[PDB]
Amino acid sequence: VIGTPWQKLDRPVSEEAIEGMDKYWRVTNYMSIGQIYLRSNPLMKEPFTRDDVKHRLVGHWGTTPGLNFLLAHINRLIADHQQNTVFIMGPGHGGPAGTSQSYVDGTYTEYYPNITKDEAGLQKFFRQFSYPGGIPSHFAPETPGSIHEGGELGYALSHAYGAVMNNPSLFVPCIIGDGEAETGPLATGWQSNKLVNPRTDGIVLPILHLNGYKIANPTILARISDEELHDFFRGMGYHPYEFVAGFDNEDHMSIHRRFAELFETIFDEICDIKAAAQTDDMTRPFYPMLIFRTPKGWTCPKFIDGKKTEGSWRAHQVPLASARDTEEHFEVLKGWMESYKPEELFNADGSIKDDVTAFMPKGELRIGANPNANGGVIREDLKLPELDQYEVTGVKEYGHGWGQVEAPRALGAYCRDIIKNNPDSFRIFGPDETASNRLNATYEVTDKQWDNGYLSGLVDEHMAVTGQVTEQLSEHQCEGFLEAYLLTGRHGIWSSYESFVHVIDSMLNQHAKWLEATVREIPWRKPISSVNLLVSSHVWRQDHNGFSAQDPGVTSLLINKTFNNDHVTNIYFATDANMLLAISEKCFKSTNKINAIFAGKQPAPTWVTLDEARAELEAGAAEWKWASNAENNDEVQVVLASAGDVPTQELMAASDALNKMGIKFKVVNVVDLLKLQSRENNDEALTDEEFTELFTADKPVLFAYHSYAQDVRGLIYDRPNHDNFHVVGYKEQGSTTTPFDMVRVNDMDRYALQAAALKLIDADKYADKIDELNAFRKKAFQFAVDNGYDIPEFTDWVYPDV
Amino acid sequence: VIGTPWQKLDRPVSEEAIEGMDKYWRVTNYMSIGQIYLRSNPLMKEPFTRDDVKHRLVGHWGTTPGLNFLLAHINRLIADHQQNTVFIMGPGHGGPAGTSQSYVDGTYTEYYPNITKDEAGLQKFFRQFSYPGGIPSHFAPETPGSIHEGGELGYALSHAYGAVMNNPSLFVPCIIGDGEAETGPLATGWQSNKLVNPRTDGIVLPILHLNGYKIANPTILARISDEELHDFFRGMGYHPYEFVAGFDNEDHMSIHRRFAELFETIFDEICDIKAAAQTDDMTRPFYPMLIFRTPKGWTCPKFIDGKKTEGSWRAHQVPLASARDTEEHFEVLKGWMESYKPEELFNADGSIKDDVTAFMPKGELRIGANPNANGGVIREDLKLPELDQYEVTGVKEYGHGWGQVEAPRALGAYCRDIIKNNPDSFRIFGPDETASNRLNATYEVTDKQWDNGYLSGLVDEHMAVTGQVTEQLSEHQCEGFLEAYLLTGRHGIWSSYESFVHVIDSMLNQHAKWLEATVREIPWRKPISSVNLLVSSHVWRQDHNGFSAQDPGVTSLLINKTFNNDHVTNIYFATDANMLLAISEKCFKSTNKINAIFAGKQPAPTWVTLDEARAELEAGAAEWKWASNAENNDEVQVVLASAGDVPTQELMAASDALNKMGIKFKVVNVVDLLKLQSRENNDEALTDEEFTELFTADKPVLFAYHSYAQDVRGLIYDRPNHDNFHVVGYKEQGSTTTPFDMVRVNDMDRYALQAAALKLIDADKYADKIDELNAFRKKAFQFAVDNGYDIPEFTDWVYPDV
Ligand SMILES: Cc1ncc(C[n+]2csc(CCOP(=O)(O)OP(=O)(O)O)c2C)c(N)n1
Ligand SMILES: Cc1ncc(C[n+]2csc(CCOP(=O)(O)OP(=O)(O)O)c2C)c(N)n1
Ligand SMILES: [Mg+2]
Ligand SMILES: [Mg+2]
């Protein structure tokens, strides 16, 4: 247990704590301006001149003194209450507030021994911010206390709420930009309080950093009337409190006392809500939220060159852009830095004075040190059930290609028993699609957690106020809740209809970038569990929906995060349920990855045994010798290769026909896509030798690909024999139609694959047969048109091994 | 002017209109069930049997009878008030409601002459829904009355609001799913009422289709308390009204009268708001919104096999899935269809009776016929100013590579004069980034439209209650407002920081799919203006931000919509301002496209004259003969090729060094990326002959690419000489650093390009020089580290022609 969770003070905040908070605020404002402006001379020792100012002024002052003031008060709160706490910096461009926090709490020097607590360390701390060879502009993963960089705005609240799930002792004050609040993801984020339980989950306190402005505009929320603003948050299930400071001549000490008192009233109400939830965990309370309204750029000069800067969008980036170039800008910088009175905050050796930090929390309650902000320190391996009990044994008993199994059903039974073994640290998310993607075997041991109105057992099923599945119709919520759940040391999976995964393409990008920085250069930030995404209800079988739901191209996005041997991204094609089981075990064991697991949910053949899936997954691509009819590679007229359940089914049917014509070929299945890249681009891929062994040195290769052929063509550009691959993929053809028609219109059906194989071998010799196959595809289509269902010879085909 | 806009009735709704609305509701429910279930015998003529039921039951009943009831009342409203109206079907899976609407209003038969108004047409209308060779499951672009398919949920409100911009006579009732309302994009969509003006824009009426459920869960908004729900909409600036029906034994006629009365009160208030805005266009009113609460699946059987179906998520997809296979399901289907009493609604010939549609609007007020739902019918070419006046003439006067121009500034001056010439039909959108991306010359003739609080001329600048620029910190709002603005016949552009474009990747996918269906097979849906997206503040020069803001991969998404010679997608690299001008003119003239226009906003060289840009843009790729030093292609030791402003600058500097070493080469610039594809994949690309002419038959090609090298490798896979291209692209390396460092870490800087060129020509001979170049890159880096700015020999270089 960290600290003493949800304890009230029962006395006023001490005047000593008010004094330290003002000193914190002044020292973090001062060091924040130092990080932005100063390359040397951090204490302004004589001579202090323009030569000390950075040549390239980059950074964001505007948000920063607001963050610094909140951080003083959140630090004071943590310490007085001993409260386990992670904050979220929505406006992550306020990096200097976050580095200053860690430098003051002592974690910066603990993690970065060269940045010491004295004048030399402070000079280095100022210079390195946003500087070549130094550190980033934002609250990046390399800053102690970050689980959220806030570079791409919008995810503050899904992360805050994912962090408190199953984390009942954790408090998360979540600082949200008022511009950030104009984004879609942030706006739906407010509703998460219907999806957490105040007894079994922790508590988020949204703090709206209502500073009036974004980059070059006021914000929507700051300019609506106060009655609308309060109604809005009340309507989303919060008790709104509002603080206003900085707009008049109120002295700073008075402002600190009034905020501290307010913040104690808010926390008292959170403690009452927590105590009450021990007895009534079914009534959803109105959680407090804080409207925090202060001038943007607070404490900077009011006017610069006749333009209002404090209390304006003009404070957003870098005031006094000429600080190095004109004595006029320099003098204003100098008076601004002096207004904090650093001579009272730093000792002669340049260390921050003891009376500046005596109010701060210590040890693992420090914001930089808490293990929830470095969740790999808390993470334990899942207790995984034995995979063998889930195997589809129909392949072993009856033959390759047996049965009509819905593949994700085996993964659902497996996830069911993972939750049973790990009952408060593995969660499932779904955007109203968990049952639709066939993961509902999980409801045998848990419920969809819903903390909002109930009506009747006639409609409410597999749903309770507490449980380990969470659904909301929002891919942004699902992805963001899960990320933070992982970042705080836990595990899970979510599932999505495949074309809708693109809603969160840019979230996958940010979390891949977080992983990239971390695996490269932040070894103190320990491995977290991987994002595991079941990508199902795919392009080939969107039976109730249509062309709008046909887009497997998240493959292509993910290919753009496969650099530097980072190995943070995996694309897997689950050929059947036994391959799906083998992939899922690997993904559930992996760390520091995004794993995209493609699988069809339609009734389909099972091709491999589980032991075969385990060996084939490890190689990445495998020959299916029991399907090939060629002696060796020299005897091969064509390589039949596929990735995806549907392309595989169709290729396999094509191989059966080609066998029957006396064509010689081998069958290669591809599961781990990126293992096709060259060793030069991927030091864990197939060696050129294993790759030639699979695909031959010079025979034609027909490659039936689940997604866009572009992907495979780009990946194998420097592989031996690449000029002989003919990649057939999805080509933006389809509609609401039968399963044969969907593969037909993309030249993916067995008949078109058989034809392409013939074309590659001898187009002249096979002209007539190709014609007959093209004509059969028209007959099969007409049959679907006339009759309402696909031609039996298509639907009824089973691989000859069964 | 369409109809008589914003007129009140001043009498009750007639009892005749109530009677017709009930008949409409019954006939559209009946035909909706017919579309889902029946392959033949639409009037249930003896014998009516299971043989008449479809073999594959696909579709969505649940939302549909709610849509049908709203559509009856919206039709009644249009007719009584003669009100110019487009509706939005948020729950676009309710396609049958939308096809039924067009079939009843007469537009279906007008557009589809084979689907006639009689028993034969009705049989064909039922069979073709969601059927091979037939029509889609959703409210697709092929349905008259659609500007919004609603397949991917979330964009209902941005589209409704983009539609009414500059459209002061248009009324848009916007039907929103209660599950859809859980998405991020929908949730921020409610706030658009701060960004429209009630005098110069039209009016949206949000209607929340509060049916209690999404696919397999209740919805958040339906289960919160009524006080929270009303506070929420009041807080977002609406006057909420709430209608509740269907949960008890109230007779349908009474329900219609109570709704009609309510809907007249709402419209009266909209008319008062419109009249008032003629005098006070500065006070933002509280626009009505409608909470519409009715049972999901309304009018279907209450229980099926002991399970509650009406008033449940169970009504979502297809009730009675065994209708063809069991006499028990069949009998329930039969009684359900009979409950609408079709014998009263259809004549013996199968035509819909006159008393069913006498209340309907006529002519161009019909929902299927209104030209706003087919905006290409309204669209006119922009009055474009002459491009020559914007040219950067420094190239002509001083030489290729002259100056320090910020390229989008020329596009801003051009957009300024386009708004001046087309003052109410060209809009600019930006997610708080219009000025940041340098398009602010537009503010010389118009303002950012802001209909929310004002404070002071000290902070409010270039902002008024009416104007042709719209900003909100949300890429979803910007993209969705613009799409509908285009779909209703108008024009514009938006701009985005490049990595944040990925927020709306899935919106680009949907609009590309809308364009694909339209160019292929809906010739009555006339061309609309193109989406024009200035993609700037790019991966190479995100000076104040960092690794998080470094992602040029929307190129890769767009490559997945380049099929079938649809030609709906363009990727352009603006080499400089004069190329940007030539691209922009072309995009502003184009129709039926998404145009992604890449340009840097940093100070940069101008390479080509405007006349040169115009010729080079048309070819797609061009040799720069004045930069090449080789006689002919046989004399060429390496092809120096680039796409992007930054890669071009660095390649050019490399060419200067290579010239000075006596290396022979040609320089090729690439602007229209997809023109690199083969003719087989793109019938408008460079022919193999023009391509070989540019890139040679067999010399090595160094290709410096702005985005991920994957893209170019996949595109040129079947081109002559592709094996000799070495593509250098962005490789997930960078941080907050100097401009040289950013190109350095990706091997993109001039020195690394010079080295790669040498390596490709003779690695052995040039070993030492390569080493010296790699060492110079380290020295330049160290210099940035030590000094705070890049080495002058790097920054101060100007191409020798100046
Ligand atoms: C999704 C997204 N779009 C655009 C941006 C560009 N951007 C970086 S900061 C900023 C303004 C943020 O304003 P606000 O949230 O009010 O933060 P403040 O500095 O006022 O605290 C913008 C638009 C972004 N970071 N993320
Ligand atoms: C962005 C997105 N995610 C997921 C889906 C999958 N989906 C299609 S309909 C639906 C439920 C919609 O419920 P609601 O909006 O309440 O509409 P209803 O049928 O109740 O009117 C879902 C989740 C989608 N269409 N779009
Ligand atoms: Mg702000
Ligand atoms: Mg609903």
PDB file of C-alpha atoms in Angstrom, chain A residues 635-736:
ATOM      1  CA  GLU A 635      10.633 -28.931 -59.326  1.00  0.00           C
ATOM      2  CA  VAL A 636       8.368 -25.918 -58.277  1.00  0.00           C
ATOM      3  CA  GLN A 637       6.482 -24.178 -61.075  1.00  0.00           C
ATOM      4  CA  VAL A 638       4.923 -21.562 -58.733  1.00  0.00           C
ATOM      5  CA  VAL A 639       5.179 -20.589 -55.037  1.00  0.00           C
ATOM      6  CA  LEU A 640       1.656 -20.283 -53.591  1.00  0.00           C
ATOM      7  CA  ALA A 641       2.013 -17.872 -50.637  1.00  0.00           C
ATOM      8  CA  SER A 642      -0.712 -16.215 -48.484  1.00  0.00           C
ATOM      9  CA  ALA A 643      -1.156 -14.008 -45.342  1.00  0.00           C
ATOM     10  CA  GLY A 644      -4.677 -13.859 -43.745  1.00  0.00           C
ATOM     11  CA  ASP A 645      -7.427 -16.291 -43.046  1.00  0.00           C
ATOM     12  CA  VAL A 646      -9.423 -15.509 -46.172  1.00  0.00           C
ATOM     13  CA  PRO A 647      -6.535 -15.270 -48.712  1.00  0.00           C
ATOM     14  CA  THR A 648      -5.314 -18.579 -47.228  1.00  0.00           C
ATOM     15  CA  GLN A 649      -8.608 -20.331 -47.669  1.00  0.00           C
ATOM     16  CA  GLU A 650      -8.797 -19.161 -51.315  1.00  0.00           C
ATOM     17  CA  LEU A 651      -5.084 -20.015 -52.081  1.00  0.00           C
ATOM     18  CA  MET A 652      -5.599 -23.442 -50.560  1.00  0.00           C
ATOM     19  CA  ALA A 653      -8.622 -24.140 -52.768  1.00  0.00           C
ATOM     20  CA  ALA A 654      -6.562 -22.904 -55.741  1.00  0.00           C
ATOM     21  CA  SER A 655      -3.706 -25.387 -54.746  1.00  0.00           C
ATOM     22  CA  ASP A 656      -6.242 -28.259 -54.770  1.00  0.00           C
ATOM     23  CA  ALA A 657      -7.330 -27.363 -58.331  1.00  0.00           C
ATOM     24  CA  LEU A 658      -3.736 -26.802 -59.469  1.00  0.00           C
ATOM     25  CA  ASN A 659      -2.714 -30.223 -57.964  1.00  0.00           C
ATOM     26  CA  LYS A 660      -5.534 -31.847 -59.967  1.00  0.00           C
ATOM     27  CA  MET A 661      -4.176 -30.274 -63.226  1.00  0.00           C
ATOM     28  CA  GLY A 662      -0.637 -31.761 -62.572  1.00  0.00           C
ATOM     29  CA  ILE A 663       0.851 -28.315 -61.743  1.00  0.00           C
ATOM     30  CA  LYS A 664       3.898 -28.524 -59.368  1.00  0.00           C
ATOM     31  CA  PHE A 665       4.080 -25.946 -56.566  1.00  0.00           C
ATOM     32  CA  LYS A 666       4.835 -25.319 -52.941  1.00  0.00           C
ATOM     33  CA  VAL A 667       2.528 -23.656 -50.323  1.00  0.00           C
ATOM     34  CA  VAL A 668       4.087 -21.027 -47.970  1.00  0.00           C
ATOM     35  CA  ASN A 669       1.936 -19.428 -45.115  1.00  0.00           C
ATOM     36  CA  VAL A 670       2.975 -15.989 -43.741  1.00  0.00           C
ATOM     37  CA  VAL A 671       2.081 -15.118 -40.080  1.00  0.00           C
ATOM     38  CA  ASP A 672       4.678 -12.605 -38.853  1.00  0.00           C
ATOM     39  CA  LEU A 673       4.659 -10.098 -41.634  1.00  0.00           C
ATOM     40  CA  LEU A 674       7.681  -7.970 -40.786  1.00  0.00           C
ATOM     41  CA  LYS A 675       9.903 -11.105 -40.786  1.00  0.00           C
ATOM     42  CA  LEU A 676       9.705 -10.645 -44.612  1.00  0.00           C
ATOM     43  CA  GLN A 677      11.808  -7.540 -44.386  1.00  0.00           C
ATOM     44  CA  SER A 678      15.560  -7.811 -45.041  1.00  0.00           C
ATOM     45  CA  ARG A 679      18.067  -8.294 -42.180  1.00  0.00           C
ATOM     46  CA  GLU A 680      19.447  -4.911 -42.954  1.00  0.00           C
ATOM     47  CA  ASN A 681      16.010  -3.312 -42.065  1.00  0.00           C
ATOM     48  CA  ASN A 682      15.134  -5.891 -39.466  1.00  0.00           C
ATOM     49  CA  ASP A 683      17.820  -7.830 -37.537  1.00  0.00           C
ATOM     50  CA  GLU A 684      15.205 -10.367 -36.427  1.00  0.00           C
ATOM     51  CA  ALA A 685      13.738 -11.154 -39.883  1.00  0.00           C
ATOM     52  CA  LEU A 686      14.340 -14.378 -41.985  1.00  0.00           C
ATOM     53  CA  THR A 687      17.957 -14.484 -43.222  1.00  0.00           C
ATOM     54  CA  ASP A 688      18.276 -14.265 -47.056  1.00  0.00           C
ATOM     55  CA  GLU A 689      18.959 -17.976 -46.933  1.00  0.00           C
ATOM     56  CA  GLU A 690      15.808 -18.974 -45.084  1.00  0.00           C
ATOM     57  CA  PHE A 691      13.833 -16.601 -47.305  1.00  0.00           C
ATOM     58  CA  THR A 692      15.163 -18.123 -50.596  1.00  0.00           C
ATOM     59  CA  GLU A 693      14.558 -21.537 -49.118  1.00  0.00           C
ATOM     60  CA  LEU A 694      10.882 -20.576 -48.641  1.00  0.00           C
ATOM     61  CA  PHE A 695      10.248 -18.568 -51.759  1.00  0.00           C
ATOM     62  CA  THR A 696      12.929 -20.068 -54.156  1.00  0.00           C
ATOM     63  CA  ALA A 697      15.783 -18.296 -55.926  1.00  0.00           C
ATOM     64  CA  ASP A 698      13.858 -17.781 -59.108  1.00  0.00           C
ATOM     65  CA  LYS A 699      10.454 -19.339 -59.485  1.00  0.00           C
ATOM     66  CA  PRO A 700       7.335 -17.028 -59.757  1.00  0.00           C
ATOM     67  CA  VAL A 701       5.546 -16.404 -56.418  1.00  0.00           C
ATOM     68  CA  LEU A 702       1.814 -15.812 -56.215  1.00  0.00           C
ATOM     69  CA  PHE A 703       1.282 -13.884 -52.936  1.00  0.00           C
ATOM     70  CA  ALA A 704      -2.396 -13.579 -51.773  1.00  0.00           C
ATOM     71  CA  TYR A 705      -2.301 -10.749 -49.164  1.00  0.00           C
ATOM     72  CA  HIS A 706      -5.042  -9.820 -46.678  1.00  0.00           C
ATOM     73  CA  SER A 707      -4.443  -6.086 -46.968  1.00  0.00           C
ATOM     74  CA  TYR A 708      -3.043  -3.622 -49.589  1.00  0.00           C
ATOM     75  CA  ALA A 709      -0.425  -5.191 -51.940  1.00  0.00           C
ATOM     76  CA  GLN A 710       1.657  -2.012 -51.565  1.00  0.00           C
ATOM     77  CA  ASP A 711       2.648  -3.202 -48.090  1.00  0.00           C
ATOM     78  CA  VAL A 712       4.330  -6.488 -49.218  1.00  0.00           C
ATOM     79  CA  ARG A 713       5.909  -4.842 -52.319  1.00  0.00           C
ATOM     80  CA  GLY A 714       7.570  -2.193 -50.191  1.00  0.00           C
ATOM     81  CA  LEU A 715       8.736  -4.640 -47.543  1.00  0.00           C
ATOM     82  CA  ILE A 716      10.474  -7.166 -49.848  1.00  0.00           C
ATOM     83  CA  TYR A 717      12.134  -4.562 -52.161  1.00  0.00           C
ATOM     84  CA  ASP A 718      15.718  -5.760 -51.420  1.00  0.00           C
ATOM     85  CA  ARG A 719      14.962  -9.492 -51.030  1.00  0.00           C
ATOM     86  CA  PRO A 720      16.317 -12.186 -53.439  1.00  0.00           C
ATOM     87  CA  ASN A 721      13.678 -13.035 -56.047  1.00  0.00           C
ATOM     88  CA  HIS A 722      11.396 -10.029 -55.233  1.00  0.00           C
ATOM     89  CA  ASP A 723      10.923  -9.262 -59.004  1.00  0.00           C
ATOM     90  CA  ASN A 724       9.108 -12.617 -59.313  1.00  0.00           C
ATOM     91  CA  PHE A 725       6.417 -11.961 -56.602  1.00  0.00           C
ATOM     92  CA  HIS A 726       2.980 -11.092 -57.899  1.00  0.00           C
ATOM     93  CA  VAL A 727       1.148  -9.625 -54.838  1.00  0.00           C
ATOM     94  CA  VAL A 728      -2.624  -9.753 -54.969  1.00  0.00           C
ATOM     95  CA  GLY A 729      -4.259  -7.614 -52.163  1.00  0.00           C
ATOM     96  CA  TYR A 730      -7.444  -5.668 -51.335  1.00  0.00           C
ATOM     97  CA  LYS A 731      -8.004  -3.045 -54.061  1.00  0.00           C
ATOM     98  CA  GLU A 732     -10.964  -0.871 -52.851  1.00  0.00           C
ATOM     99  CA  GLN A 733     -13.547  -3.153 -54.394  1.00  0.00           C
ATOM    100  CA  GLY A 734     -16.530  -4.522 -52.599  1.00  0.00           C
ATOM    101  CA  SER A 735     -19.956  -3.827 -51.203  1.00  0.00           C
ATOM    102  CA  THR A 736     -22.749  -5.479 -49.236  1.00  0.00           C
TER     103      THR A 736
END
